[PDB]
Amino acid sequence: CGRLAVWLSMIGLAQYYKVLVDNGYENIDFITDITWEDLQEIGITKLGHQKKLMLAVRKLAELQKVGDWLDSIKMGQYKSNFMAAGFTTFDLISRMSIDDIRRIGVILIGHQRRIVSSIQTLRL
Amino acid sequence: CGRLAVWLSMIGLAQYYKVLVDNGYENIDFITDITWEDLQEIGITKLGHQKKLMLAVRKLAELQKVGDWLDSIKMGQYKSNFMAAGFTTFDLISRMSIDDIRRIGVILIGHQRRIVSSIQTLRL
Numbered sequence: 001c002g003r004l005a006v007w008l009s010m011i012g013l014a015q016y017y018k019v020l021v022d023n024g025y026e027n028i029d030f031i032t033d034i035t036w037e038d039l040q041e042i043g044i045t046k047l048g049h050q051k052k053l054m055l056a057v058r059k060l061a062e063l064q065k066v067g068d069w070l071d072s073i074k075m076g077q078y079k080s081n082f083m084a085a086g087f088t089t090f091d092l093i094s095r096m097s098i099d100d101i102r103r104i105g106v107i108l109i110g111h112q113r114r115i116v117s118s119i120q121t122l123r124l
Numbered sequence: 125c126g127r128l129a130v131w132l133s134m135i136g137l138a139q140y141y142k143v144l145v146d147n148g149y150e151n152i153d154f155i156t157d158i159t160w161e162d163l164q165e166i167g168i169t170k171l172g173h174q175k176k177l178m179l180a181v182r183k184l185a186e187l188q189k190v191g192d193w194l195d196s197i198k199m200g201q202y203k204s205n206f207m208a209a210g211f212t213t214f215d216l217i218s219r220m221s222i223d224d225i226r227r228i229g230v231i232l233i234g235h236q237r238r239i240v241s242s243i244q245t246l247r248l
Contacts, residue, residue, distance in 0.1 A: 006187045010180060011134060056134060063130045 004028040011056040016044055024110025027074065032061045033113045041109055066090070073118045081105045093119055128152040135180040140168055148234025151198065156185045157237045165233055190214070197242045205229045217243055 004021075007028055008014045023042045025031055034057060039050050066088075067079045085104040087093055098116045106112040128145075131152055132138045147166045149155055158181060163174050190212075191203045209228040211217055222240045230236040 003187065003189065006183055006189070010183045010187065059130055059134045063127065063134065065127065065130070 004031060007060070011053075013049060013053050013056070016049070016053065019043060020110075024108030024112070024114075026110065027114075028060070030074070030110075030114045032057055033117045034110075035113070038109055038113060069118075069122075070115075073114055075111065075115050075118075078106050078111070078115065090122075094123060128155060131184070135177075137173060137177050137180070140173070140177065143167060144234075148232030148236070148238075150234065151238075152184070154198070154234075154238045156181055157241045158234075159237070162233055162237060193242075193246075194239075197238055199235065199239050199242075202230050202235070202239065214246075218247060 001017075004026065005014065005017050008017050008020070019042055020026070020031070020034075023038075025034060025038075025042075034054070036050065036054065039053065044050055044053065067076075067083075070076050070079045070082070081104045082088070082093075087096070087104065096116070096119055098112060101112045101116055106115060125141075128150065129138065129141050132141050132144070143166055144150070144155070144158075147162075149158060149162075149166075158178070160174065160178065163177065168174055168177065191200075191207075194200050194203045194206070205228045206212070206217075211220070211228065220240070220243055222236060225236045225240055230239060
């Protein structure tokens with residue numbers, strides 16, 4: 001298959017590919033945001049695997065060594081949502097809750113992770 | 125540390141970093157040439173780990189999805205050797221044995237792997 005699939009096989013957690021994708025952890029680039037609670041929610045229930053996957057991701061991270069902005073994080077689909085909900089100004093984006101993101105219709109836990117943490121980033 | 129070190133830690137065979145380097149498997153780009161016999165020689169003696177490392181490398185490969193030529197494979201140091209030994213013509217290079225490579229003074233098993241298989245490549 002793809003890049004994530006291969007990497008997951010490499011670390012031995014291929015089992016979680018479909019799971020991880022079906023909740024919008026589909027891009028190895030943006031797999032690195034997953035948070036403990038995200039795996040809990042996603043049904044990666046084995047604490048062993050939670051710890052392991054998390055560690056692997058930490059290593060993957062070390063390893064890498066406006067509508068416009070939505071494209072930058074590969075979140076263009078949601079541009080529609082944001083405009084329909086009147087979130088054009090960055091000011092308003094700056095104080096977006098994850099619920100706010102969820103509430104305007106970004107359902108996938110992963111996506112909504114990707115976008116919430118990109119905002120936080122933009123704070124700094 | 126570096127890129128190989130991190131990847132080896134990721135697949136759990138960090139033990140073999142120094143070993144792998146000290147025999148000139150130092151570049152993740154060119155780790156993919158290692159052959160069964162190379163690990164045997166290098167002292168990666170556990171058949172389990174031999175199989176495992178080899179599989180991981182196979183995945184790493186799928187994952188990636190003249191003096192002049194020596195530079196291309198990051199083997200410039202050996203340019204001296206080749207000229208001192210009168211291996212300037214590609215014809216002669218084409219039929220180089222690994223011993224021939226070894227015999228002209230490319231000691232490190234890894235390096236000499238990198239260069240021998242680059243020739244084979246250039247045959248096709």
